[PDB]
RNA sequence: ACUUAAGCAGUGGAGCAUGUUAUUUAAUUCGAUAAUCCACGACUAACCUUACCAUAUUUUGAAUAUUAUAAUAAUUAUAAUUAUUAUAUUACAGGCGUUACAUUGUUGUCUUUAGUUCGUGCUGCAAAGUUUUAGAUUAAGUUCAUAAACGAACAAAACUCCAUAUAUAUAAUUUUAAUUAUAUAUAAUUUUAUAUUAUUUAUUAAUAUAAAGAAAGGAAUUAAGACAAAUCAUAAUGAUCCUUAUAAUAUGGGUAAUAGACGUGCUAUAAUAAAAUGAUAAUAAAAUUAUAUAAAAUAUAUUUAAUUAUAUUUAAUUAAUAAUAUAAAACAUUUUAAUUUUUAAUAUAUUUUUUUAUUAUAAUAUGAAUUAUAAUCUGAAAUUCGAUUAUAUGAAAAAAGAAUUGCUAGUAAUACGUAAAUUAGUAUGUUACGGUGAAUAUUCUAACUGUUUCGCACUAAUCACUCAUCACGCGUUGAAA
């Protein structure tokens, strides 16, 4: 008789396992890999994996046509999955009705990977005005991107550079905010300034990258640069911030204060004292297509470099920012909401606005034992909390808790609400 | 130089068993997630185990101590004291709560372990160095050589213990396997004599030949780094959290649900291979039996008996004594679809279990999953959810391939079996034990390690330092209508 709350379902993130469009996977396997003997493709894929294995390493533009083949065979799946989950995250937390973008930009090394994901998410009936997609690594990536996009129903405009005469209300960035290990502080600033100028009012910008500690640091720095939390102390809740310009965070951060998990230098994770550090990443599962299963085979990709699965667990970190509309109404609303609204010090245990924009963030796998579930949350109070929900406290609320996973916004109250210790090894750096 | 390349032996498309994953579930107890690949402990999950779900149900509970009332004793003298035993008594006990809660202990994985300190001696003004040598030899630290170096301690080696061959002792050869058993002891790292080729040229290695030999294998045994851990079920202590609940008991359920996905094994796909039979009993080893084992016999399947499975009944043995238990492959005969390569009627023969002549004459008699009936074993209980027997069933499985396992050896393989642990009951799993017993040679590739050469503005040591840029101030000097 006991069932999940509608509030919990609203807070729940998308759960079902991912999968490529059958037409897209069939086309990829039939064309992009059939004409090439598998061994050389596996060799180049092994090279790319080995050169990204280094700690705090980066993705790299496809120099050569063989590298283009390898990237579509190996790395396109996880980019597509990350885009799928982040885009559905945006779609749910802005509401299905309000998410109807018409001017679209995708920026990424691979094919128009956000464009195919957008087509899949908004169905085959969505036909917006502009579907620009700039491709960087190689010119031949455009050809195979056209091969992918032909099977999905072209109007999409495959370019090699950003048009510099138009704004955009949907923008997707895939591994775009940092290209060199050096200049990590504000080269992200440079990139985000370049992409932020072409984002229309009411538009969406969706950033996604690797989800390793270097990744999480890039996300944290980008958020800090955009928001300037230090410029707005004691301002709890989500209000758009100046940066006639205003922007707000949607996900995965349920506040706009300093990130509790941020330590400035990624190299701290490599030391013998930063091995206990924790970074904000998110996990998803995606079914392995045939060409993937046919690829990871042999001593190159199937052995231990010193049972399998039909799916891959991809890690990723991401951000989403919404633009405020340009109008005297919106401007005055922002100014007054900052002026006379004393939202108060959101105390440990506070849910903030008790809506989607401010519900806590599950950032770790909850520990579910008989009669109690423990959750590690990033709360709208700007802090890192540990919330324990017991059956004695409430049966319905415990029932909701035991079905909660990492990456859900858990929307209700708990019995115990203490300061979580995940940031213990942060101040000492 | 791991690992690769080669050679050999395989396994490898199906069914089932057993795991993990996904999904579902009231629960399907617990395990991984920084992009090759990896959530994967089972010496037995029906109940218990059990940790999960549902419903009831217990509240100082498992212990230590305190302070009190009741009985029991012992003493003194009913009372005093001691103890014991209950009932309360509150600190609390308890916790398969937490590693995003840490540190030791350890548990493993990888690298280096002829090398690290110490003491002297010597060289340099000194920081330092300890030199030839960055040597030779071997399959490898297994062995030498040299030189301002030489020592001791650990480590390694030797040594030790197995196995093997012998000697002594022991056994009144009925506990008999004296072909054995277990104590002590010896032996080998084999020793030699020549020939040839190399050699630092003999007082040396490669071989080969001859001689004495039973002599041919094996394990263990140390530290230093570095990574990984919470079924870290390889623990302790501490931190924090629950204290009508995250502690505790009972009933039932679940851990066995299936669209799927991948590992591990068992059974198969027929003739260099399966089936039946083979009583004066072809031939073992290592084990186990007081919380047992179960012999022979009788009876029913069932049928003259045999075999196989239960039932009745306990003979010996608690053991070098009796039982588990007549080891099986091996070997002999017979049969075996595809196969008109066969069987049958007539004749026929110096092939007679046989030959000739004329007519007739894609899944089988492989496979045993699945399904049905009726019985049986354990246990109190076999529905979810065990094993066994008989009578019906009779699926997929044929061709070629990705892929991968192991590699001189009593090893692989074996339609060869035997035994033990866990068990009241269930092994296609694990660990032991013996029987038969092969093949093949290694161009190649190599991370990585060890020495080295050169450079060095770095020294908390390239995630280094220096240089230049951008803003903010404070100064200084030089020209000046
Ligand atoms: S959710 Fe919290 S921990 Fe994660 S990036 Fe945002 S602020 Fe940081
Ligand atoms: Mg029970
Ligand atoms: Mg049970
Ligand atoms: Mg305690
Ligand atoms: Mg418990
Ligand atoms: Mg048969």
From Swiss-Prot:
* Similarity section: Belongs to the methyltransferase superfamily. Rsm22 family.
What other note does the entry give for this protein? Present with 1900 molecules/cell in log phase SD medium.
Keyword list (alphabetical) reads: Iron, Iron-sulfur, Metal-binding, Mitochondrion, Transit peptide
Q: What is this protein called?
A: Ribosome assembly protein RSM22, mitochondrial
Residue span relative to the full protein = 61 to 564 of 628
Q: What does this protein do?
A: Mitochondrial ribosome (mitoribosome) assembly factor. Binds at the interface of the head and body domains of the mitochondrial small ribosomal subunit (mt-SSU), occluding the mRNA channel and preventing compaction of the head domain towards the body. Probable inactive methyltransferase: retains the characteristic folding and ability to bind S-adenosyl-L-methionine, but it probably lost its methyltransferase activity.
**Which terms does the UniProt entry file under GO BP?**
mitochondrial small ribosomal subunit assembly; mitochondrial translation
Per the record, the domain of life is Eukaryota
Which residues does the annotation say bind [4Fe-4S] cluster? 253, 259, 280, 378
Where mainly located?
Answer: mitochondrion
Enumerate the subcellular locations listed in this protein's record, separating them with semicolons.
Mitochondrion
| Oligomeric form and interacting partners | Associates with the mitochondrial ribosome (mitoribosome). Only transiently interacts with the mitoribosome.
Q: Which GO terms describe its molecular function?
A: 4 iron, 4 sulfur cluster binding; metal ion binding; methyltransferase activity; structural constituent of ribosome
Per the record, GO CC terms?
mitochondrial small ribosomal subunit; mitochondrion
């Amino acid at each position: 008789e006991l069932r999940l709350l509608s509030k919990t379902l609203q807070g729940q993130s998308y759960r079902d396992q991912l999968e490529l469009n059958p037409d897209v996977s069939k086309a990829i396997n039939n064309n992009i890999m059939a004409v090439h003997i598998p061994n050389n493709l596996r060799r180049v894929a092994t090279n790319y994996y080995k050169e990204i294995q280094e700690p705090n390493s980066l993705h790299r533009p496809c120099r050569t046509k063989m590298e283009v083949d390898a990237h579509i065979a190996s790395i396109f799946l996880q980019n597509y999955g990350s885009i799928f989950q982040s885009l559905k995250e945006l779609q749910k937390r802005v509401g299905p009705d309000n998410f109807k973008p018409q001017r679209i930009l995708d920026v990424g090394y691979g094919p128009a990977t956000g464009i195919v994901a957008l087509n899949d998410i908004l169905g085959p009936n969505y036909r917006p005005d502009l579907k620009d997609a700039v491709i960087l690594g190689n010119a031949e990536m455009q050809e195979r991107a056209k091969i992918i996009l032909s099977r999905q129903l072209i109007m999409t405009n495959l370019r090699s550079s950003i048009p510099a005469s138009k704004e955009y209300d949907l923008i997707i960035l895939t591994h775009q905010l940092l290209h060199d290990g050096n200049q990590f502080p504000i080269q992200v600033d440079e990139n985000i300034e370049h992409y932020l100028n072409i984002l229309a009012p009411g538009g969406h910008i969706v950033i996604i990258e690797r989800g390793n500690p270097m990744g999480f640091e890039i996300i944290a720095r980008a958020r800090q640069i955009t928001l300037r939390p230090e410029n707005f102390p004691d301002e709890f809740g989500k209000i758009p911030r100046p940066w006639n310009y205003f922007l707000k965070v949607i996900a995965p951060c349920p506040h706009q204060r300093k990130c509790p998990l941020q330590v400035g230098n990624p190299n701290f994770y490599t030391h013998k004292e930063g091995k206990d550090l924790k970074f904000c990443n998110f996990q998803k599962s995606i079914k392995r297509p045939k060409f993937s299963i046919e690829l990871k085979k042999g001593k190159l990709l199937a052995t231990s470099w010193d049972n399998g699965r039909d799916y891959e667990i991809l890690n990723y970190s991401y951000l989403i920012f919404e633009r405020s509309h340009k109008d005297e109404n919106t401007l005055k609303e922002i100014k007054k909401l900052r002026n006379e609204n004393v939202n108060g010090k959101y105390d440990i245990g506070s849910l903030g606005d008790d809506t989607q924009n401010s519900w806590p963030r599950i950032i770790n796998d909850p520990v579910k034992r008989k009669g109690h579930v423990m959750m590690d949350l990033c709360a709208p109070s700007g802090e890192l909390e540990k919330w324990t929900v017991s059956r004695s406290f409430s049966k319905q609320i415990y029932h909701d808790a035991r079905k909660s996973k990492k990456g859900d916004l858990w929307a209700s109250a708990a019995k115990t609400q203490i300061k979580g210790l995940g940031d213990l090894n942060v101040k000492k750096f």
